[PDB]
């Protein structure tokens, strides 16, 4: 394509620093910018970046190489409302606007420091139908992966990170689920690699 | 900050060869008005842009099948006939001020499923799971997931809502719905939400938890001759109460 960017995803701790870059070969590129699409939501412009050199908005360093037509965008401090799809665009030099090129865009997540890990697989009974249930895993800290199911009929989702504002406390959790006959929340998540201390609740 | 594009319908379903128009309105000032086409979420690529009344540029993306107005003092419009499978996207409008150099605002995006056939179409059923009492007793947190199943195509919204009212703190939802059928060109889709509370506020029988989901479906015009209920916009909502 005419506009690349890389790297295709990056995962950033709460305070860490994230590098994008965009390149691209047609050099009647002239005016370069950095958009960020947050879920759900349309694009919306993070900052133009049109001259050779930095331009630093707050946590935001933008560069561009005129030379090489490299750009790229700095963040510092990364914040949670940062988790987003941040996509390069160019577009040439024209008294008529034009319309914008874009990369294919870099998922950036910033995840948080787990301060009081407490891995734990709870099972939760369906409110009209306490016969059906599913597996919660939570409280696990950055330093766990969760896997992708490999069985057909047990069905996985990814980590997810919700935020309690008012405690000032964030935990991950993933949902597992089957009606396989023999599933069960002790072996749900058999694919991961799980703290060994994990609490299992009889 | 200030006004925002805004796009009707915010999804839309039809049957391949019919004709669909997707209406934008652009911030009022702005002289530049523009379509884009996202493709698998991500892929963002430009169709056409408007001005003073007229078609200025145009991609090599931009088909006869597609045709662009703007009568005045009614929308800006994008315009698709006969539809095709693979004009099935999210497609963007977006509006600026004069000048090359000029910041585009985007819209919210108009998602376009284009299908074979219609009797594909499955709105979600909704459950909602109750806390675990070990959770509780562990970490005087309490979690509800809500679980989305049997969907098809993948044009839902889920919110919760707590007495009443919608609550946005201590909630999660996932990014991306699982297929339930994967090897399926036409799987439904499984879709899930975390909700989670202090234990002292589900431990009483007067507090009310929902979990709503919003699906976007078929519309008046569709047609629809088979005996299960036409699967039309619709919210489907599973609830709780806390137990003490």
């Known amino acids: 394509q005419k506009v690349q960017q890389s790297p295709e995803s990056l995962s950033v701790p709460e305070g860490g620093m994230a590098s994008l870059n965009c390149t691209s070969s047609?050099?009647?590129?002239?005016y370069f910018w950095w958009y960020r699409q947050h879920s759900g939501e349309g694009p919306k412009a993070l900052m133009?970046?049109?001259?050779?050199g930095d331009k630093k908005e707050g946590r935001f360093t933008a560069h561009l190489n005129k030379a090489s037509l490299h750009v790229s965008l700095h963040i510092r401090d990364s914040q949670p409302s940062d988790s987003a799809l941040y996509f390069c665009?160019?577009?040439?030099?024209?008294?008529?606007?034009?319309?914008?090129?874009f990369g294919l865009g870099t998922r950036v997540s910033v995840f948080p420091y787990i301060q009081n890990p407490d891995p734990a697989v709870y099972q939760l009974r369906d409110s009209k139908s306490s016969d059906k249930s599913v597996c919660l895993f939570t409280d696990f800290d950055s330093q766990t992966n969760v896997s992708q199911s490999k069985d057909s009929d047990v069905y996985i989702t990814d980590k997810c990170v919700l935020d309690m504002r008012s405690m000032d406390f964030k935990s991950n959790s993933a949902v597992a689920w089957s009606n396989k006959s023999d599933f069960a929340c002790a072996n749900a998540f058999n694919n991961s690699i799980i703290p060994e201390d994990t609490f299992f609740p009889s | 900050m200030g006004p925002k594009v805004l796009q009707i319908p915010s999804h839309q379903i039809i049957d391949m060869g019919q004709m669909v128009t997707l209406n934008c309105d652009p911030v009022?000032?702005?002289?530049?008005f523009y379509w884009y086409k996202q493709i698998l979420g991500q892929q963002m690529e430009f169709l056409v842009n408007?001005?003073?009344?007229?078609?200025?540029?145009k991609s090599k993306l931009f088909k006869d099948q597609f045709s662009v107005e703007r009568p005045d003092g009614s929308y800006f419009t994008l315009k698709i006939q006969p539809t095709a499978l693979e004009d099935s996207a999210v497609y963007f409008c977006?509006?600026?001020?004069?000048?090359?150099?000029?910041?585009?605002?985007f819209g919210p995006g108009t998602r376009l499923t284009v299908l074979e056939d219609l009797k594909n179409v499955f709105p979600p059923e909704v459950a909602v799971f109750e806390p675990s009492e070990a959770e509780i007793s562990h970490t005087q947190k309490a979690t509800l997931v809500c679980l989305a199943t049997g969907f098809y195509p993948d044009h839902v919204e889920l919110s919760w809502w707590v007495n009443g009212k919608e609550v946005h703190s201590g909630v999660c939802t996932d990014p991306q719905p699982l297929k339930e059928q994967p090897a399926l060109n036409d799987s439904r889709y499984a879709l899930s939400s975390r909700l989670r509370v202090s234990a002292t506020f589900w431990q009483n029988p007067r507090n009310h938890f929902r979990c709503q989901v919003q699906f976007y479906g078929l519309s008046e015009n569709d047609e629809w001759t088979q005996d299960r209920a036409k699967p039309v916009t619709q919210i489907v909502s599973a609830e709780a109460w806390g137990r003490a």
């Open positions: 977006a509006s600026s001020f004069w000048g090359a150099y000029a910041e585009q605002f």
């Open positions: 047609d050099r009647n590129f002239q």
């Open positions: 133009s970046i049109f001259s050779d």
């Open positions: 665009a160019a577009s040439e030099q024209n008294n008529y606007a034009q319309g914008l090129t």
């Open positions: 009022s000032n702005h002289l530049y």
């Open positions: 408007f001005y003073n009344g007229k078609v200025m540029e």
